[PDB]
Amino acid sequence: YKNETEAYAGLVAVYDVMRKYSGGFENTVSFLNAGSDDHVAGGGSSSDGAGIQGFSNFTINPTIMPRSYWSDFYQGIFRANVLLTKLPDVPMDESQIMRFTAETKALRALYYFNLVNMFRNVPLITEPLEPSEFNSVLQADPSAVYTQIEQDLNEAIGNLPDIISDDQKGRFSNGSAKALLGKVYLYQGKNQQAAAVLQEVNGTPGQTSQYGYKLLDNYDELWTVSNKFNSESILEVAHTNASGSGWGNWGQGTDEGNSINVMLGPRSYNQITEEAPDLPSGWSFNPVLPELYDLLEGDPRFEATILDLKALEEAGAASYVPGYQDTGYFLNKFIPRVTDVTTLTGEPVLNYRQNTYVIRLADTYLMEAEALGGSGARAQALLDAVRARVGLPSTPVSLTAIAKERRLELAGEGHRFYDLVRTGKAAEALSDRGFKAGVNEILPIPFQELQSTQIVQNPGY
Incomplete structure (x- = not known):
């Protein structure tokens, strides 16, 4: 890296891997949605995305598990690993080496957290x-991976800005770290440490935090x-819609469009x-159950x-054609209107531009209340604020009332499956979909990652 500009381009390439949440067919949010008790895969037929269909009916296995859910995150980690070796030598202000270094660590932590949650043994x-x-x-024990995640985030915190300017938003601050x-x-049951940092x-x-976080007055916005x-x-x-994505680069690093937006439409x-x-029209993925x-x-x-x-058809107001495992109900949060269709160069369905909340403030309120055992005045005030x-009206706080609130507040945002698994409720909630206890809490390691390696397959696969 000759200079800052080049160094920054290297950091942008680590941040790019966050588009895996909602970009390309094999994004994490629609796949995770498909395995919850709120959605199925949907799509156009039983064979429309072998991986997501396999998760949705718990026949998922190492042959049909898409490899990109493993490799894309590893690609981001390896980029961050190299970039940490290069940053100290860059000819630029020390304060920028410090910031870039903290952002790289925060990203590595995020991507390892994605891997441990999906695969556990990596x-x-x-x-x-x-x-x-x-x-x-x-493979490491998950607790070692967690120790690295915490260390990375502990080293970043204190070395980032607290408030990010509008043109840099999307980058890590002390608040989002x-x-x-x-x-x-x-996620590890470290409740006291969770509550303290979430505070x-x-x-x-219900008011504005020191990091400028405030709930929107209107949920719909x-x-x-x-x-x-x-x-x-x-x-x-x-x-964004300005990358001009075509069929030739759909789902590559240069494709900045939101793929959930086309996937979910009727x-x-x-x-x-x-x-x-x-x-x-869209591809009818993640029908609402x-x-x-x-x-x-x-x-x-x-x-x-x-x-x-269903209701719109019944009133004569619209028509549609059912896709696979249609319910008549669709996940409206991420369904574009004609006003959202790009006028810029590129294929219309590949250049939808809605952003994706990896973490938003209602979710952190609910997480702190949970970390507090669902008990006491602060926990009550946190639940009260989301509901209000x-x-x-107010409802008495408890772990049960918090889990219910999360399901109503965060539906379709990719959290339900991991919430069920980490709270021990998954087997019971998903048994009728084919979920097998001691197996399907985590996903299979893609078969190709075992070939010529020391990697061992996860239990029961």
Whole structure:
């Protein structure tokens, strides 16, 4: 790296891997949604995405598990590993070496957290591998991987800015690193450490935290496509329509479009009257299941969350054509209107531009309340604030009331499956979909990652 500019381009390339949440077909959010009790895979037929269909009915196995869920995160980690060796020597201000270094560590932590949650048993690699180190590394115990995640985030925190300027938003601050660390603690049952750091993140619930975090006054504006990096955003993936993606680069690093936006829309949609929205057609992935519909139906977050094509058909206001395992209910939060269709160069369906909340403030309120055991005045105030934002009265705080609130607040944002697994509720919630206890809490390691390596397959696969 001759200079800052080059160094920064190297850091951008580490950040790019966050588009794996919502970019390309094999993104994490729609796949995770498919394995929860709120959605199935959907799509056009039983063979439409062998991996996501396999997760959705728990026949997933090492042959059909997409390799990109392993390799893409490792690609981001290896980039961060090399870049940490190069930053100290860059001819630029020391304060920028310090910032870039902290952001790189925060990213490595995030990507390792993604791997441990999906796969649990993974090699711990923190330095550029010699050609021989590479093919011979062993899986680490998850706790070692967690120790590295915490260390990375503990070293970053204090070395980032607290407040990020509007044109840099999307980059790590002390606030979003803390929020991530809080979640990391929570995911290991380190409740006291979780509550303590989340308190810093959240501040006084219902007001503005020290990091500028505030719940939006209207829940529905969270899903306004142009309302990017709003006050509720903590960690957010940037998508755009200006990359001009075509079929030739769909799902590569140069493709910045939001693929969840095309994947989730209804098929052959026609707007008959103005009572229905004007929508481009999509591929009917992540249909909303009736259990979630019935929970949300009288709830204020119903219209924002669920596009009720059943009801619109019944009123004569629209028509559509059912995809695979259609329910008539669709995940409205990420379904573009015709006003969201690009006018810039590129294929229309590949250049949708909604961002993705990796962490938002309602989620950190709910995580802190949980970390507090669902008990006491602070936990109550945190639950109260989430509910009040949508006009719901106070309800007595408890672990059960928090889990219910999370399901209504965060539906379709990719958290339900891991929430079920980490709280020990997954087997019971998903047994009827084919989930097998002691097996399907984690996913199979893609078969090709075992060939010529020391990697061992996960239990029961």
